[PDB]
Amino acid sequence: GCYEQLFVSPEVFVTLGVISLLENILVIVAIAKNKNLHSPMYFFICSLAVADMLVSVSNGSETIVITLLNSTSFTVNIDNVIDSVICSSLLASICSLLSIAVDRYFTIFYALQYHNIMTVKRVGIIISCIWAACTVSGILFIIYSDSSAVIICLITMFFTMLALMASLYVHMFLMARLHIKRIAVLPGTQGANMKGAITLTILIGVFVVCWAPFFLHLIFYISCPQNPYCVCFMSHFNLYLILIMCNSIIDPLIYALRSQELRKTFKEIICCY
């Protein structure tokens, strides 16, 4: 059944959209309502939560619009607007994950200068510049979607930012391991080596598993469109979109929910609402 395009029940798209919407909204509210959670790292987490909310919303909207139109000029403009929103939001999500990791690398490797670098003014400038560039790129990538240049630029940006994220986290891990080696050599003395390896495994594995199939799809979309096996692989586009939305639902649990303050704020908000 590879030749036929895989059809995924709209209900699944609307369910993932609503649940991730709820969680992302809670993450944003918890940050806005807790004055202690105003460091640059939480502004970057907020930006990520916003991008994930945008992915879940627009895509979900596209699903509902398609379903309603199918049950029953305008179609072209609606499709172009929604797709430009989705592309911009996906670029913003990837850039936000890179910023988070990039922010963290700074703290670990610039512990004494860190505050003279990531000043709130600069955090606001960086976030606004990222969002503006992502919106503009999403619009240009949809207006000229029928061109190889757009797909090539999308796979280049993805794989450059994947390599950067993996490099930054591997370097921080190696520094943590060096500290472990020095701490353990004392006269008075899972484990830290396992906790660190698990943290890297989750942080990189989730990103790669939930994103990469889509960009592999685009790679085949330029390289081998007519090949009998690549056609079968491309039949799962509707599943690769679900994996991407599943990153929108998962990511808050590996960044926003690791901090104790955000957990406390979540639990108070949940009991209030």
Partner: peptide, 13 residues
């Protein structure tokens, strides 16, 4: 003729 589908680049052209 033209239709709307999930995402983009669904089918190669």
């Amino acid at each position: 003729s033209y239709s709307l589908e999930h995402x983009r680049w669904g089918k190669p052209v």
